[PDB]
Every structure is written in structure tokens, then in C-alpha cells.
Amino acid sequence: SGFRKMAFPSGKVEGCMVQVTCGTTTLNGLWLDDVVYCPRHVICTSEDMLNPNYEDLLIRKSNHNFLVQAGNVQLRVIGHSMQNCVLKLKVDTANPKTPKYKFVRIQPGQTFSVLACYNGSPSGVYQCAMRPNFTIKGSFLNGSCGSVGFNIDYDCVSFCYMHHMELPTGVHAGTDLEGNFYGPFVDRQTAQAAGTDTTITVNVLAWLYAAVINGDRWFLNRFTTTLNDFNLVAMKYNYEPLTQDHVDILGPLSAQTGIAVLDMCASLKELLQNGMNGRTILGSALLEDEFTPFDVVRQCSGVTFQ
Amino acid sequence: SGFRKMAFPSGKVEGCMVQVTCGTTTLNGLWLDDVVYCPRHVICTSEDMLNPNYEDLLIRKSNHNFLVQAGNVQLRVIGHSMQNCVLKLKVDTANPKTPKYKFVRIQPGQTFSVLACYNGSPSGVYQCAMRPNFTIKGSFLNGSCGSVGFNIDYDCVSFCYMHHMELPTGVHAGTDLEGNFYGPFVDRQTAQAAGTDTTITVNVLAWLYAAVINGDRWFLNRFTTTLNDFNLVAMKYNYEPLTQDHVDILGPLSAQTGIAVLDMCASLKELLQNGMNGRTILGSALLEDEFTPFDVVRQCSGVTFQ
Numbered sequence: 001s002g003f004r005k006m007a008f009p010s011g012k013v014e015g016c017m018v019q020v021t022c023g024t025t026t027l028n029g030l031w032l033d034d035v036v037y038c039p040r041h042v043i044c045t046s047e048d049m050l051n052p053n054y055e056d057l058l059i060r061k062s063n064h065n066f067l068v069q070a071g072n073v074q075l076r077v078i079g080h081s082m083q084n085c086v087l088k089l090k091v092d093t094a095n096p097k098t099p100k101y102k103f104v105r106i107q108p109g110q111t112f113s114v115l116a117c118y119n120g121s122p123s124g125v126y127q128c129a130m131r132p133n134f135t136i137k138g139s140f141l142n143g144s145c146g147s148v149g150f151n152i153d154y155d156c157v158s159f160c161y162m163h164h165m166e167l168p169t170g171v172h173a174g175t176d177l178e179g180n181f182y183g184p185f186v187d188r189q190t191a192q193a194a195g196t197d198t199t200i201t202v203n204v205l206a207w208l209y210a211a212v213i214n215g216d217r218w219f220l221n222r223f224t225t226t227l228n229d230f231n232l233v234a235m236k237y238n239y240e241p242l243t244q245d246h247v248d249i250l251g252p253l254s255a256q257t258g259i260a261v262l263d264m265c266a267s268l269k270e271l272l273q274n275g276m277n278g279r280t281i282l283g284s285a286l287l288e289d290e291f292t293p294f295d296v297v298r299q300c301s302g303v304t305f306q
Numbered sequence: 307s308g309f310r311k312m313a314f315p316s317g318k319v320e321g322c323m324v325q326v327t328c329g330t331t332t333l334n335g336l337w338l339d340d341v342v343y344c345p346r347h348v349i350c351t352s353e354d355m356l357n358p359n360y361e362d363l364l365i366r367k368s369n370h371n372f373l374v375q376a377g378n379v380q381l382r383v384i385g386h387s388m389q390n391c392v393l394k395l396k397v398d399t400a401n402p403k404t405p406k407y408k409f410v411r412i413q414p415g416q417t418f419s420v421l422a423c424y425n426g427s428p429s430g431v432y433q434c435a436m437r438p439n440f441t442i443k444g445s446f447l448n449g450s451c452g453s454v455g456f457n458i459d460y461d462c463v464s465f466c467y468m469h470h471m472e473l474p475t476g477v478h479a480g481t482d483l484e485g486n487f488y489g490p491f492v493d494r495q496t497a498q499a500a501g502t503d504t505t506i507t508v509n510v511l512a513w514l515y516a517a518v519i520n521g522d523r524w525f526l527n528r529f530t531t532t533l534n535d536f537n538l539v540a541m542k543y544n545y546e547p548l549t550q551d552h553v554d555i556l557g558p559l560s561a562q563t564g565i566a567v568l569d570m571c572a573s574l575k576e577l578l579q580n581g582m583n584g585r586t587i588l589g590s591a592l593l594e595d596e597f598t599p600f601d602v603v604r605q606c607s608g609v610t611f612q
């Protein structure tokens with residue numbers, strides 16, 4: 001027992017990180033097979049970032065202008081192409097450490113691991129959720145761009161995120177591995193609006209199930225509710241509306257604990273209206289929304305990768 | 307910017323995890339050079355765990371009774387010895403993935419990464435602190451024993467923890483890699499007392515510096531204090547006493563932010579006396595104590611490993 005914000009083991013992704021340099025800009029790339037994927041803004045000067053014409057900037061770049069380094073080894077670039085907001089650099093060597101992998105576009109509320117990197121070297125790993133406003137709350141400094149987010153399914157790495165930028169508010173935006181931004185964001189040094197950061201209701205309920213499994217039971221109340229009643233309260237507190245699809249996904253946790261999903265919703269409703277009165281749940285003083293129902297099952301049942 | 311509970315990249319340690327089986331008990335071992343390290347309680351039946359005589363139990367075990375599996379490969383055990391609460395199994399093959407490494411015994415308040423494993427396979431990675439009562443608050447299920455805690459210094463892995471057990475209160479106890487428990491705990495299924503879990507004051511102050519660096523400034527107050535005044539308040543709230551050694555360690559953070567350590571102590575004193583009034587700091591509703599001053603510098607300056 002115990003319940004922790006747990007990332008996937010990072011080794012499979014560590015073996016894919018390289019350094020990409022174009023002129024005076026260095027960031028991270030992802031080397032899979034004989035392609036290196038990186039943020040197209042590698043081609044930009046700080047001046048360019050104000051109003052970049054990526055097509056025009058790219059015309060001045062040749063294969064030999066992209067410096068790709070895998071630890072000590074230089075990779076030879078034999079082709080380059082722009083796909084949305086990423087560059088695909090074709091190299092003459094397939095990554096010998098390439099894992100089984102997929103490119104997936106995740107939905108808001110879904111979680112993933114970030115391997116934060118600088119100059120193609122890993123600094124750390126942490127768990128993130130795609131926020132309902134399509135931002136993530138990460139830890140990224142200058143040079144971290146091209147760091148990736150991923151999930152592992154036994155032996156297959158599903159890459160879902162590449163880091164591209166920080167909003168003036170200090171939240172993070174990026175793309176899938178086809179170079180399409182999550183949300184309405186663009187790779188330009190312009191003021192960009194994050195909308196309302198709503199709480200991922202289904203994830204809060206999953207974590208309340210985790211709390212019960214782990215003996216943290218004080219918040220269980222005598223009440224039930226309905227989806228419409230709960231949602232009328234969820235709306236007021238900027239919680240995502242809970243759907244029958246969400247109830248269905250929580251079924252296995254409901255079954256393990258013997259607590260009906262709607263009873264757990266009534267507990268959550270009282271926690272929203274009354275707060276925690278200075279108490280904690282799994283060591284948090286607020287309602288945690290970065291565990292999915294799949295995350296809770298996974299952690300509470302000890303599923304393995306290799 | 308942003309500030310996250312960040313583990314070390316896990317790849318170097320993933321390459322060291324193996325499965326150890328003795329009779330009907332399976333747990334994890336750590337394969338470094340031609341030695342596999344594991345919890346000595348691998349030799350125990352659930353009956354044995356009530357009052358084990360490890361010396362007597364060990365007499366009935368031969369090299370061929372320890373089944374060691376590295377993914378698909380069986381390792382051949384050519385020797386075994388008990389060191390405190392760990393077994394050292396000598397194998398005929400040096401781990402080809404052995405990193406540069408050290409065995410270190412950490413102090414309470416120090417942080418490390420855990421790679422949670424089952425049957426020699428990694429499930430996840432998270433950051434822990436050695437609590438002042440020498441427990442850790444982990445995420446460990448049946449089979450996780452022999453999972454290790456570690457720090458990385460560029461290319462060298464410092465192993466500091468091996469998981470051995472859960473207290474009836476759901477906190478975790480284990481050893482250094484010489485098999486000496488942290489704290490007064492024993493590898494026996496007996497009721498064992500965790501003492502007071504005090505807050506790591508120096509770590510709270512480091513995280514308050516991280517908050518300021520990351521623009522979360524609302525808690526900065528107009529006051530200062532002294533070490534004796536602050537400590538009189540720290541004691542009442544079960545905070546560890548702050549020493550001049552602690553002030554010294556916070557010097558670089560004090561220098562970066564221009565906030566005197568004692569001014570930050572006066573801010574912390576008001577947060578203890580008055581609480582957060584429903585506000586957050588780096589997305590927490592409580593004062594976080596599992597970042598060291600070294601952790602904050604490291605994360606805020608993007609230091610790299612390989």
C-alpha cells in the first residue's frame with residue numbers, strides 16, 4: 001500500500017534522446033528508426049520567434065545545417081521535412097535502441113510521463129495530465145524543448161507529447177509527434193490565452209477510490225446523489241461534467257471497494273461544499289486530478305513493463 | 307519554469323533489476339558486477355516471518371536454491387552470504403549493464419528516487435524522502451521488496467535504499483545496500499512503532515525559495531525572525547529544529563532570490579500560525595518537505611546525467 005504520483009520507467013525513452021542544433025539554437029530530438037523528431041522552432045533566432053515564417057526560414061536550411069549528436073556520436077542528416085510544427089530529420093543510421101512505439105494523440109484528462117532533457121541528456125522524470133484547456137503544468141527551462149511525454153503498454157512506448165513552449169502564465173504547450181499543437185496554441189512569441197483550467201472530475205473520483213483502498217476513509221459520507229445533481233455542483237466549482245462513460249470507466253474500482261460511483265460522487269460533493277477542514281487525503285490538502293482510473297488500477301495491482 | 311516532484315531517469319537502475327526466487331517467495335534483486343543483492347527475508351515462509359531465525363533458515367539453503375532470472379536468462383549462483391538483512395548472491399556473470407555506482411547511507415531529510423519493481427520488472431518511478439522517523443512513504447505491494455532507492459551524480463548511481471517491509475500503519479522500512487535498516491526496524495512480522503513524523507524544515511524553506519523563483523510570492527511577509535524564535539514555533543508544529551548548517555546550505559538560494567534565510571523563516575512562521583487561508587503554493591495546499599536545497603538548485607538550473 002501507499003499511493004504515489006508515479007512516472008513510467010524512463011530507460012526506453014532515454015535511449016531515444018539526442019541533441020539537435022541549428023545555428024545558435026540547441027534543443028532535444030527524439031531518434032526513432034532513422035528519423036529524428038524535433039520542434040521546428042529550432043530554425044528560429046530569438047528575433048525570428050516574434051513573427052516566424054517557418055516556410056521562408058526553412059528555405060535557408062540544408063541537411064548539413066542540422067547538427068544531431070547522440071552522446072559522443074554525430075549523426076549524418078540525409079533529409080529533412082516539416083510536418084506541422086515538427087521537423088523530421090532523416091539520418092543514415094537507425095537508432096539501435098529504438099523501442100516498439102506508437103504516436104498517439106491523447107484526450108484532455110489523460111496522464112503521461114515527461115522525460116525532461118537538456119542538450120539530449122535526461123535530467124528527470126515526472127507525471128503530467130493534459131489539462132482540459134490543453135496546457136500541461138510541467139517543469140521546463142530554456143533548452144528543454146523537444147522533451148517528450150509518453151505512456152508504456154508492456155513493451156510498446158506511446159509518444160503523445162513534445163514540449164515546445166511556455167505561456168506568459170508559466171504553463172506549458174506542445175504538440176503530438178505529428179507536430180499538431182494540443183489546444184489553440186502556436187509556436188510564436190505572442191501573448192496566448194489559456195482558458196479555464198477545470199478539474200478532471202473522473203480523475204478526482206479515481207483518486208478517492210485509491211484513498212479508500214489505502215485506508216484513507218474519513219471523507220466517506222452517508223449520502224448519495226445523481227449525475228444531474230452532482231454536475232449542478234461540479235459546474236459551480238469548475239469541475240468537468242461527469243458522464244455515464246466516466247461512471248462506466250470507474251466500474252472496476254466501484255467493484256473492488258463496494259462503493260457505488262454515485263455514493264463516491266456524494267462524498268466529493270461534500271468535500272467541494274465543505275472543504276477538507278484541515279485534513280489530508282493520501283497526504284494532499286487538495287483534491288488530486290492527475291490520476292486516471294487506469295492509473296489507480298495499474299498502481300494498486302502492480303502491473304509491469306519490459 | 308514550473309516546479310515538479312521529479313525522479314532521476316531510471317534507465318541505469320532498470321538494467322540492474324532481476325527476479326530472485328527461494329522456494330515459494332519471489333522478490334527483486336539488484337545485479338551489480340557479479341553480485342545480486344536482495345532482502346534476506348526471501349528465505350522465509352509466511353509462517354517463518356512471525357519469528358525468523360535467519361541463521362538457522364539459511365543453513366537449509368544451497369546456491370542452487372536461489373533462482374535468479376534476468377529477463378529470459380537464468381543466472382548461475384556460485385556463492386551466497388548474509389550481510390545484516392541482505393543476501394549477496396555471487397553469480398558467474400558480471401552484469402554487462404552495471405553502471406558506475408556507490409553504496410551510501412543517507413541522512414533523514416535526504417531525498418531519493420525509488421524504482422518500484424515486481425518479479426524483476428520495473429512498474430514505476432517516484433521521489434521519496436527519508437523521514438526523520440526513518441520511514442519512507444512509498445507505494446509498495448506484495449512482491450515489491452528488493453526495489454531500490456538511488457540518486458545519480460552525472461554518471462554514478464548512489465544506491466541508498468532497499469525495500470523490505472510495511473508497518474501496520476502503511477509506511478515503509480528498508481535498509482542501505484550493506485543490509486542495515488534505517489531506524490529501529492527489524493525484518494520480522496511483529497508490531498513495530500514509527501515515532502513522530504516531523505516536517506523537514508530546511509526542505510520546506512528550499513521549496514519556498516523554489517516558489518519565489520517560479521513567481522508564487524503571495525506568502526512573502528514584512529517580518530524577520532531569529533533561529534531561536536523560529537525554532538520555538540517550529541517545535542510546537544513538529545518541525546525539525548533549524549540549525550546554522552541548514553542556513554548555510556540555503557545560502558545559494560538566498561543569493562539567487564535576494565531573500566535572507568531568516569526573512570523566509572518569518573514567512574514560514576506566519577504560514578504555520580495562520581495556514582494558507584485556502585490558497586496554494588506551487589499547486590500544493592500544504593507545506594512540501596520532500597525537496598532538498600540541492601534538489602531545488604538542480605531542478606531550477608537543469609543539471610543533466612549520462
Ligand SMILES: CN(C)C(=O)N(C)[C@@H]1CCS(=O)(=O)C1
Binds near residue numbers: 165
Ligand atoms: C517557443 N518558446 C520556446 C517559448 O517558450 N515561447 C516563444 C513562448 C510563447 C509565449 S511567450 O511569448 O510568453 C514565450
Ligand SMILES: CN(C)C(=O)N(C)[C@@H]1CCS(=O)(=O)C1
Binds near residue numbers: 472
Ligand atoms: C517483511 N514484510 C514484507 C513485511 O511487510 N512485514 C513482515 C511487515 C512488518 C510489520 S507487519 O507485521 O505489519 C508486516
